UniProtKB/Swiss-Prot annotation:
It is an enzyme of class 3 (hydrolase). It comes from Oryctolagus cuniculus (Rabbit). Residues 94-107, 342-354 are annotated as: Interaction with alpha-actinin. MICAL1 and MICAL2 produce the (R)-S-oxide form. The (R)-S-oxide form is reverted by MSRB1 and MSRB2, which promotes actin repolymerization. GO terms for biological process: actin filament bundle assembly; actin filament polymerization; mesenchyme migration; positive regulation of gene expression; skeletal muscle fiber development; skeletal muscle thin filament assembly. SUPFAM superfamilies: Actin-like ATPase domain (SSF53067). It catalyses: ATP + H2O = ADP + phosphate + H(+). One of its GO terms (cellular component) is filopodium. The modification N6-malonyllysine is found at residue 45. In vertebrates 3 main groups of actin isoforms, alpha, beta and gamma have been identified. The alpha actins are found in muscle tissues and are a major constituent of the contractile apparatus. The beta and gamma actins coexist in most cell types as components of the cytoskeleton and as mediators of internal cell motility. Its main location: cytoplasm. This is Actin, alpha skeletal muscle. SMART domains: ACTIN (SM00268). GO terms for molecular function: actin monomer binding; ATP binding; calcium ion binding; calcium-dependent protein binding; cytoskeletal motor activator activity; hydrolase activity; identical protein binding; magnesium ion binding.
Length: 358
C-alpha cells in the first residue's frame, strides 16, 4: 500500500518510499558489462567493465538499460514487488511525449505496477521548499533547467534549458588541473576529481576580485590527498570551475549563464507573477551545492531585476535530494490519490493516457 518514489537522474538514482524524509537508496545511474552490473557494484568494478549511462541530459536514451536500473531499484535496493506499490517516477522539464509514454508502458507492462505517475523534477523541488509558486533552478549531473511554476504547475513556455551541469564541471576541473599540471585520466581519477570538485570548489562573490586574491596570495589554496598518497594543491581552480555556470564561455559554450537563463525565464512569464518568481527563486540539485552560489545568484539577479524588486534565493541544505523529498510528500498526499494513473485506466486508454493525467 506504501507508494514508491523513484527519482532518476543522469548521474544518480534516488529511490524510496513516500512518507520518508529521505531516499533509502542513492546510487550511480550506470550499467556495466564486462552478466550485468548496476549502480554501486558496476562502479566498484569499473576497471573490468565498460559503463553506460541510460539517462543523458535528463532524458532516458537507453531503455533496455533503464529497465535494468528500475529492476535493480525495485528488487535489489528497495526490495519490493513493484506490482504491489503505486509508483511515482520523475522526469525532466520538456520531456518528449513519446518518452513519458514509453515510461508508462514499461511500468505497467514490464513491472506490472497497480498505478503510477510521472512528475516534473523541478516542480517536486518547489514543493519540498514549502511553496507552489516560484522559479526553480535545478542543476544536476547532466542538465540545468529554470522552471517557473505558478500555483502548483510548471509554465512550459517559460522553461529554459542549459546543457551544462556537474559532469561538465568535473571535466573542466580535470582540464584546468592538468594545465597546472597534474595528471588525471581514468574513471578512477574521474571520481577523484569529482570528489575534489565537491569538497574544495566554491563560487566567488566577485570573480575578478577572487582571481586577484589568488594571484597575490596563497590563502585560497587548499591541499587534497589522493588515494595513492600524493598531495595536490588547487588555488583559483576552486572557484574557476563553478564560475563556468555564470560564464559558459569557460568551456567554449555560447550560452547565457544561470543568472541570465533565470532572468530570461522570468521574462517569458506574465508580468503580474514576476514579483513572486523573484521572491521565490529555489535552488535544486547537486550542482547548486557550491558554497557562495546563493549569494552570487542574489547579486547577479539583483543586477538584472528592476531596481525595486525583492529578490530571494532559497537554497535548502537538503537540495541534493529536493526532487525526491517533493515526490515523497506529493505521493503521500490524500489530494493526490486520485491523480495516480491506475492499471485499469491504462488498460483502457494506452500509454497516451499519461498526457491526460500527468
Ligand atoms: N557538494 C557539491 N559541490 C558541487 N557539486 C556537487 C556536490 N554534491 C554533488 N554535486 C554534483 O551534483 C551532481 C549530482 O546531483 P543530482 O543528483 O542533482 O544530479 P542528477 O539528478 O543525477 O542529474 P540531472 O538532474 O542533471 O539529470 C554531480 O555532478 C555531483 O558531482
Ligand atoms: Ca535530477
Amino acid at each position: 500500500t506504501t507508494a514508491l518514489v523513484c527519482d532518476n537522474g543522469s548521474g544518480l538514482v534516488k529511490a524510496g518510499f513516500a512518507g520518508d524524509d529521505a531516499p533509502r537508496a542513492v546510487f550511480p545511474s550506470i550499467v556495466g558489462r564486462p552478466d550485468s552490473y548496476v549502480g554501486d557494484e558496476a562502479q566498484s568494478k569499473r576497471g573490468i567493465l565498460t559503463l553506460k549511462y541510460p539517462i543523458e541530459h535528463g532524458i532516458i536514451t537507453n531503455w533496455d538499460d533503464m529497465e535494468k536500473i528500475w529492476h535493480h531499484t525495485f528488487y535489489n535496493e528497495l526490495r519490493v514487488a513493484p506490482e504491489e506499490h503505486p509508483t511515482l517516477l520523475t522526469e525532466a522539464p520538456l520531456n518528449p511525449k513519446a518518452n513519458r509514454e514509453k515510461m508508462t508502458q514499461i511500468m505497467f507492462e514490464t513491472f506490472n505496477v497497480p498505478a503510477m505517475y510521472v512528475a516534473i523534477q523541478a516542480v517536486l523541488s518547489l514543493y519540498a521548499s514549502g511553496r507552489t509558486t516560484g522559479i526553480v533552478l535545478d542543476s544536476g549531473d547532466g542538465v540545468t533547467h529554470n522552471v517557473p511554476i505558478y500555483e502548483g504547475y510548471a509554465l512550459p513556455h517559460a522553461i529554459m534549458r542549459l546543457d551544462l551541469a556537474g559532469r561538465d564541471l568535473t571535466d573542466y576541473l580535470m582540464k584546468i588541473l592538468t594545465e597546472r599540471g597534474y595528471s588525471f585520466v581514468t574513471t578512477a581519477e574521474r571520481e577523484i576529481v569529482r570528489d575534489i570538485k565537491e569538497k574544495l570548489c566554491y563560487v566567488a562573490l566577485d570573480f575578478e576580485n577572487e582571481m586577484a586574491t589568488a594571484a597575490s596570495s596563497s590563502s585560497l589554496e587548499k591541499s587534497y590527498e589522493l588515494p595513492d598518497g600524493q598531495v595536490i594543491t588547487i588555488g583559483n581552480e576552486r572557484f574557476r570551475c563553478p564560475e563556468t555556470l555564470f560564464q559558459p564561455s569557460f568551456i567554449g559554450m555560447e550560452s547565457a549563464g544561470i543568472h541570465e537563463t533565470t532572468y530570461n525565464s522570468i521574462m517569458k512569464c506574465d508580468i503580474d507573477i514576476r514579483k513572486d518568481l523573484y521572491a521565490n527563486n529555489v535552488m535544486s540539485g547537486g550542482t547548486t551545492m557550491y558554497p557562495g552560489i546563493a549569494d552570487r545568484m542574489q547579486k547577479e539577479i539583483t543586477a538584472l531585476a528592476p531596481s525595486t524588486m525583492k529578490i530571494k534565493i532559497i537554497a535548502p541544505p537538503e537540495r541534493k535530494y529536493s526532487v525526491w523529498i517533493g515526490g515523497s510528500i506529493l505521493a503521500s498526499l490524500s489530494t493526490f490519490q486520485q491523480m495516480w494513473i491506475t492499471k485499469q485506466e491504462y488498460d483502457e486508454a494506452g500509454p497516451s493516457i499519461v498526457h491526460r493525467k500527468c
